[PDB]
Amino acid sequence: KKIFKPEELRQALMPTLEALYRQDPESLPFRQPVDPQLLGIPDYFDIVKNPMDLSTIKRKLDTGQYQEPWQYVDDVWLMFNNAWLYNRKTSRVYKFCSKLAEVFEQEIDPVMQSLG
Numbered sequence: 001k002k003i004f005k006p007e008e009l010r011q012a013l014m015p016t017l018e019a020l021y022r023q024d025p026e027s028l029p030f031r032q033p034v035d036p037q038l039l040g041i042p043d044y045f046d047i048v049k050n051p052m053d054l055s056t057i058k059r060k061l062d063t064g065q066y067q068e069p070w071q072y073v074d075d076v077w078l079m080f081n082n083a084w085l086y087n088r089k090t091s092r093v094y095k096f097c098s099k100l101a102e103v104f105e106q107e108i109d110p111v112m113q114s115l116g
């Protein structure tokens with residue numbers, strides 16, 4: 001089995017996360033964990049059982065919590081799927097999520113080819 005080192009993953013994958021952060025306005029709702037109290041949405045954690053956001057993914061890369069690139073991809077997709085599940089299709093957050101998914105798809109593919 002291919003063994004990936006933490007810094008190899010950070011060097012390869014952090015730029016793809018940065019590409020998401022660079023999207024403005026689209027990344028703005030994703031830069032910190034959803035706070036249902038601040039946002040007045042007490043149903044949030046009833047619907048979203050496994051929250052995820054850019055800051056959490058960044059911390060996981062920085063602290064070596066991914067063994068394999070697919071685990072990073074899964075967390076990015078968890079973030080997207082949570083947002084598409086919770087938010088209405090007409091909402092800013094939903095449409096912003098869709099743009100981030102486009103950007104991520106584009107950025108991640110050449111990187112995955114390089115890591116194989």
Ligand SMILES: COc1ccc(CCc2nc3cc(-c4c(C)noc4C)ccc3n2C[C@H](C)N2CCOCC2)cc1Cl
Binds near residue numbers: 030039086087093
């Ligand atoms: C720039 O875009 C916005 C600005 C304000 C709002 C309303 C408030 C809001 N509505 C938000 C909704 C979410 C959210 C996500 C993500 N998934 O479910 C929910 C609910 C997360 C954060 C949200 N936030 C916080 C926003 C983004 N601020 C963070 C600080 O800097 C920019 C302004 C929504 C948006 Cl999309």
